[PDB]
Write a protein that binds this ligand. Sequence first.
Ligand SMILES: Nc1nc2c(ncn2[C@@H]2O[C@H](COP(=O)(O)OP(=O)(O)O)[C@@H](O)[C@H]2O)c(=O)[nH]1
Ligand SMILES: [Mg+2]
Lengths: 177, 185, 178
Amino acid sequence: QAIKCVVVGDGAVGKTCLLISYTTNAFPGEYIPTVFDNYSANVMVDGKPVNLGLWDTAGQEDYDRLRPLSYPQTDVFLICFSLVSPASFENVRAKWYPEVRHHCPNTPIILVGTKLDLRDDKDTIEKLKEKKLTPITYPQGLAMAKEIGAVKYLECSALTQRGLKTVFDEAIRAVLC
Amino acid sequence: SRTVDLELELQIELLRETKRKYESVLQLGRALTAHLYSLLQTQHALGDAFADLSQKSPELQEEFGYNAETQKLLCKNGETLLGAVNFFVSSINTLVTKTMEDTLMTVKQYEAARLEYDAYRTDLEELSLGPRDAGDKYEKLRGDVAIKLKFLEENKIKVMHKQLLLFHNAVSAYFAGNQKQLEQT
Amino acid sequence: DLELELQIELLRETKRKYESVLQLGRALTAHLYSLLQTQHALGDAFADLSQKSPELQEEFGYNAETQKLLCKNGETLLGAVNFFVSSINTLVTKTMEDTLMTVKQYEAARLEYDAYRTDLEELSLGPRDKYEKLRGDVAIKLKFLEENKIKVMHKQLLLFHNAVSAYFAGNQKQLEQT
Ligand SMILES: Nc1nc2c(ncn2[C@@H]2O[C@H](COP(=O)(O)OP(=O)(O)O)[C@@H](O)[C@H]2O)c(=O)[nH]1
Ligand SMILES: [Mg+2]
């Protein structure tokens, strides 16, 4: 079966690394592979052969006009936000939740917490406070999902794969219900 | 000892083969949508880079800017193309996924009834060969699929005609208004 | 010396942008290649349906020809785009390096003269000349490439644009040959 999954969310969140790590099991931090490329996958969702169509995007305002061009005929949105970026997390309601709904108000949404490793590290943890800010917790992300209407809320690290493989299994299940 | 509705079964094979081919087109269409969205974006980037380099290089200010404006014209025009292909893909998806599936749902019931009838009449024969004895569902279904196969073929022509006409036009209009200014900027 | 290191710092910002262009370049190649594969397969799928679907023979017919013509023309365009990026590459991976390398040789014997000055400066009053030779092969080497940049980018930028243009013209023409 064919399911179309679009990955949206503030740039820098890791939408591209999320998809390369998942589909190729490698981090793109090496040369930053082919720009604006999209990715597909074949997964077994419970004795079920599925053809996953993953659409990457660009969060910068410059593309606000040709971004919704990929939303038609979509089956499951994955609004992403960096757990290390409280700012990006705010735009989850400030920009994403609306835009996705502005076009397809009836499509399931999965909120993801990209970068679950740089949540307890010695570096950003300090400079995060340096800006009078702190990392995104389970709550307010778990409530953010509910504040929207997400069929699920997961977290993962495209650099550790922990929780990665799952994020999409949930995207698919959310589809065939 | 096998029941054959020649004309009907020939139509069924054709519907299955048609559905196979359309599903193939549907896949290609989807790919077409991906690649086109990938091509598009680039042209937006390229446009911007070339526009950048155009300002930071007077030696090549006219060369870079000539391209910038073209890679920018295309992009915009390739937004109208993408939209058209999505329309093509979803329209034919309704036809295959819903309308053709509804009929095949009836084609399967009829085939099941046809096979049960054959087994039934065969059981009867090998039962006569013994202590001696030589003295609806399938038919109702057979009639139900014929009607549906006809409604479906009618609707298939209409949907495909409209979609083949618009897809072609969209694909070519991505050259007409793309030429009158491709080098007129 | 300011001159050179103002000329170099620009020769890098430029080697960079031309890379960012070279990126968007292979990308364009990539996406273009795929799109052609799809149009090729789509034209065969349409030609086939045309032969089998007499009810929609024309519609599948003009759609296959179009896709086939588009694929054919796309080949040339691809060639061009490749020649582009390729050449732009030669100007970055080799020619520019050859220059960016002699700079490294220049930088090697660069701050060592500015260092040994302030260094062996403390040592004085109490109680070795080919440094410029490299300067030649870095100034005469440097802006001897700038002419080369111009010569290449000018030509390359024109072929590319013409190619893209030609694409749509060649398309629009034969597209009206029905
Ligand atoms: N440590 C860490 N860095 C990440 C992770 N995902 C992405 N990054 C980094 O975040 C930056 C932006 O990631 P990217 O995938 O390009 O974000 P995008 O705008 O959503 O495509 C890059 O420098 C990545 O190396 C992650 O899972 N862990
Ligand atoms: Mg990205």
